[model samples]
Target: APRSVDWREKGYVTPVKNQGQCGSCWAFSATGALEGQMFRKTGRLISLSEQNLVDCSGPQGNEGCNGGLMDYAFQYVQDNGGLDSEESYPYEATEESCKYNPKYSVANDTGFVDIPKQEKALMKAVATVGPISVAIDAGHESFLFYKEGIYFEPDCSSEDMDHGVLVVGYGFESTNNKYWLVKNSWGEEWGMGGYVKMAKDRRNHCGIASAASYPTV
Candidate 1:
C-alpha cells in the first residue's frame, strides 16, 4: 500500500493566517492543526479563535510574542475551551484575553493529540496520519515579505517564531522526490498561501515529531 493521505478531506484545509511577528506561532500551528482535524472528522471548517491559546497557555516564559512550544499551548486549551475566530478574538500576536464563546457551536469543535518525542515515531505517524502541527524556520524574509510556494531560505538563527504552519500530507516531488508536504499560514499569499514541502524527515527543531495535532471539532 502507498504511504500517502488526503489532508483536505482529513480536514486540513482550514484558512491560513500568519502569526506575523508574534512568538505565538506555536499556538497558531497547534490550534490550526486541531481546527483542520476537526473539520476533516466532521465536515465543517469553523474558524478557531487564536486568542484563546495566545492568552492562556499558562506560565509560558513571557514568550507571548516570542517563539514558544505548542505542546504547552495545547495543554492550556485542552483545559480551557478552545478559542474563537479572528472576527471575535482578532490577531494581535501579543498576549490578549480569551474573549467570546468557546465556539463549540461552530462546524467543528477543536481538540488535540498527544505527540511522541521520538523522531522515528513521529515520522511514522506523519506518514500514516493526517495534518501534523509543525513549527518551521520561517526566515526573517518570511516575517517581512509574504508570497507563495514552499518557502526556502538560508537562515534559522532568529529567536522569534516568524511563522507557524501545518503539515497536511507528504509525497515525492516530481523534480526532486525527496521531501515532505508542509502547509503555511500567510493566507495563501506565501507558499501556496498555506502549504509547503519540507525536506523528507528534515529535523530543524520545527517540532516535527515533537509537534502534536489537536482536532478541531
Candidate 2:
C-alpha cells in the first residue's frame, strides 16, 4: 500500500468553490484532482471541466450530489480513455448527458495500478503523477470553507455529505502522525484558493481518505 505523502512542500495551492446544492461531489473530486495533476505536469492550473466528470462518469450508484468514492470516478476515466477540458465538454452538475466527442482528448493521467490494496501505489503515483481525486468528510463548518469568511451549517447528524476536492499534496502533522494537505474547490478566498490541509485520515475518518485517488502523468 502507499505510504505518507507531502503535498504542501510541492508548491501546490487549493482552489476555491461553491457546491450550489448540486450533488456532484464525484465531479468535483475528479476535476479537483485532475486540476492539480495538470498543474504539476504542464505547470498550468487550468480549470478542467467538472461537467465532463459529472456526465461521463458512469454506473452512478454513489449518489451523485450527496456523496461517492473518488476511486470509482478514477476508474470511470481510466476505462473511458480519460476526461476533457471544461472548455471542450463544459459542465452542468445537475443535469446528465453523454456528450461524447472523439476530438476531446483530455489527459490520460490514469497510471493504471491495482486499487484498495494499491493505497501506497496510489500515493506514489500522486507524488510522481499529478493531483489526486478524493472525497473527504467535508461536512464540517470549517470545511464549509469559503473565500471571505468561513460559513456553513451542515447537518451534523444528517451526514449529508455533498462536496469534492483534490489532494494536491500530503504531510504529517507535528501533533500527530496523520493529516494531509488537500486543495479545495472554493476558489482562492478561504484557504489559499479553498485549499486546506486535511488529516491523513484513517479508514475514511471524516473522509480524510474516504475516496482518495490520483492521476499518473
Candidate 3:
C-alpha cells in the first residue's frame, strides 16, 4: 500500500464538528468513525447524534459530559438498536437526561474493531477502514493554538489518554515528514479548521496508537 492516503480526499471523512465545553470528545470520536464507515459503505453522508450517545450510552459505562470511552459508546450503539441523526437529537454541549428515541435513529453499527497498539498497524487500519477513533494527551494548553505543521508534542505523555479525537487520514509531505490528519471536536476556529496533523512513523506520540479503534457497519 502507498505511504499516503487521505480518507477525506476519498470522500469517506465527514466535516469537522464542535464538542463545546463538555468533555464529550469520546462521543464525537465514536460518531466520527461511525459516520465515516456508514458513508464508505452506503455512499451516503449523514451526521449521527453525539448527544444521543452522550445521554443514552451512559448506562453502558460512559460518564456523559464528564468523560467516556469510544469502545463503550460503540457497544452502546449496538445495544441501543442504532444511532439517531444530529437533527433528531441535537447537541446540548452539556450533560442532559437520556431523551434518545429509537424511532429517530438514522444509522447503526454492527460492531467495531480495535487496532493494535502500534503506529504502523494504526496507519494500515486507517488506510483500509476509513477514519479511526483515537485517544491522546490533550491536557496541554499549547494544543489550543496549534496552527499548522506536523505536531510532535514531546511533553505529551502516551500513557495519559485524556482526550478522544478522530484520525481521518494520513499523508507525507515534501520534507519526508509523515503525519496523521486528525479531526478535533473543539470547533472550526481551533487548529486547522478543527483539524490537526500529528507526527507519524514515530513511537505513538501523544498516545494516539495506544487506543486506536474504528466503527464497522
**Highest lDDT among the candidates is held by which one?**
3
User: Can you rank all candidates by TM-score, best first?
Assistant: 3, 1, 2
lDDT of each: 0.57, 0.57, 0.88
Candidate 2: count the clashes: 30
lDDT of 1 by residue, 1-217 (tens): 1455546655556667777666666766776666665655766666766666677665633256655666566555555555555567667767766454764424233344665654456556665556677655566555346343334444543233445567776665554444456665555666554566655544434344444454434
Worst 10 residues of 3 by lDDT: 1-10
Q: Residue-wise lDDT of candidate 3 within 1-217, one digit each (tens)?
A: 4788788887876678888889899999999999888898899889988999898887789988889999999999889888999989999998889887889888888778999999989988987888899998887877877988899887988789899999988888896888999999988888898899998877788999999998778
lDDT of 2 by residue, 1-217 (tens): 2455655456443345554567776667666666666667777666666666666665744455555556666666667776776778765556567675657756556643322423354456566765666555566666554333212223322223445566666556453455455666554566745666554434334543434556555
Per-model TM-score, in order, reads 0.71, 0.65, 0.96
Q: Model 2: residues >4 Å from true position, as ranges? A: 1-19, 36-46, 60-67, 109-129, 145-163, 171-179, 200-205
Better of 1 and 3 by TM-score: 3
